[PDB]
Write a protein that binds this ligand. Structure first.
Ligand code: HEM
Ligand code: HEM
Ligand code: NA
Ligand code: NA
Lengths: 150, 150
């Protein structure tokens, strides 16, 4: 309430401080490009095989392989790697770029569920990193929810 | 047209490639924190002394010293320095965070004018950097205009 990052914390239960703990060490240096590519691939397989119509139909106007490229490049860029996303698309502008979608509370949890699963399948992400990443995903999911409202 | 970064290029005359040339070398390493603090201070002095009512009244609900802190921290973060902005506020989410303001074509040029002046007064920014920075400011100003429309 009264500030996007505040709504995100209240809704998500993740403190903004926690959310950006990713910035304390270079995760990309820890995990490498391939971890991120596999992660987003896994994630989007699940999304595009999601049987939950309402979710899934959210992604109908996008290409699976494009969305994968969009996502891992943002993650690579944002977690210590080279700025691949900006090189190609400019500012992440997450709220702006999610404007066309119905980013609801329920949708945030669905998104986060597929991601939790994709993170679990990941063979190359250590616990500490998994926690930091989920804290970041979860805070920002609800940051998007807050943005979808205002 | 059809894509935020495309509108920005068409309106602004700055190719998105040009806009993100800042990512080729560490500008923060070149210029240091103080350059950025002085730059934003200069800039916001001008903004808050702007006699153009319509512009200036855009910034009425903000504190001069807060806006300065917001801006130089984003620039520091985005041009090679430590992620000060995110540490404090989370995602830059530029379109989202400019939603409350009337970000018009005319406003973009005004903003860019004060910035051009502030860049000129800067004693520690070399030509090459000035060009890269203005390309980045100008592209992103119109990216914000595009965002203000859609
Ligand atoms: C709240 C639940 C969310 C929903 C329903 C959602 C939905 C979508 C959809 C439909 C797209 C377009 C796919 C594409 O063509 O690239 C997209 C793009 C994207 N999403 Fe999400 N998203 C959510 C949360 C998140 C979160 C938590 C992150 C980051 C941690 C994120 C980052 C992105 C990025 C980087 C893109 C690509 C932007 C672009 O290049 O256009 N999203 N999202
Ligand atoms: C298009 C012309 C623009 C107008 C009229 C405009 C207006 C504003 C206003 C009124 C604020 C709130 C001040 C504050 O309290 O921090 C603001 C914040 C900000 N603007 Fe702009 N702006 C423009 C373009 C830009 C450009 C080109 C950039 C980056 C290159 C930028 C980056 C920011 C940032 C980082 C903030 C602080 C966000 C926050 O923490 O809430 N703006 N802008
Ligand atoms: Na942004
Ligand atoms: Na953003």
């Amino acid at each position: 309430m009264q500030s996007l990052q505040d709504k995100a914390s209240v809704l998500s239960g993740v403190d903004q401080a926690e959310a950006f703990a990713i910035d304390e060490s270079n995760l990309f240096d820890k995990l490498g490009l391939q971890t991120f590519i596999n992660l987003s691939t896994n994630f989007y397989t699940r999304v595009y095989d999601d049987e939950e119509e309402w979710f899934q139909s959210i992604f109908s106007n996008s290409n699976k392989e494009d969305a994968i490229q969009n996502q891992y490049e943002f993650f690579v860029q944002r977690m210590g790697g080279p700025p691949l996303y900006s090189q190609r698309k400019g500012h992440p502008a997450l709220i702006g770029r999610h404007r066309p979608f119905p980013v609801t509370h329920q949708a945030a949890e669905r998104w986060l569920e597929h991601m939790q699963n994709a993170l679990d399948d990941s063979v190359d992400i250590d616990q500490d990193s998994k926690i930091k990443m989920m804290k970041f995903f979860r805070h920002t999911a609800f940051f998007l929810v807050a943005g979808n409202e205002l």
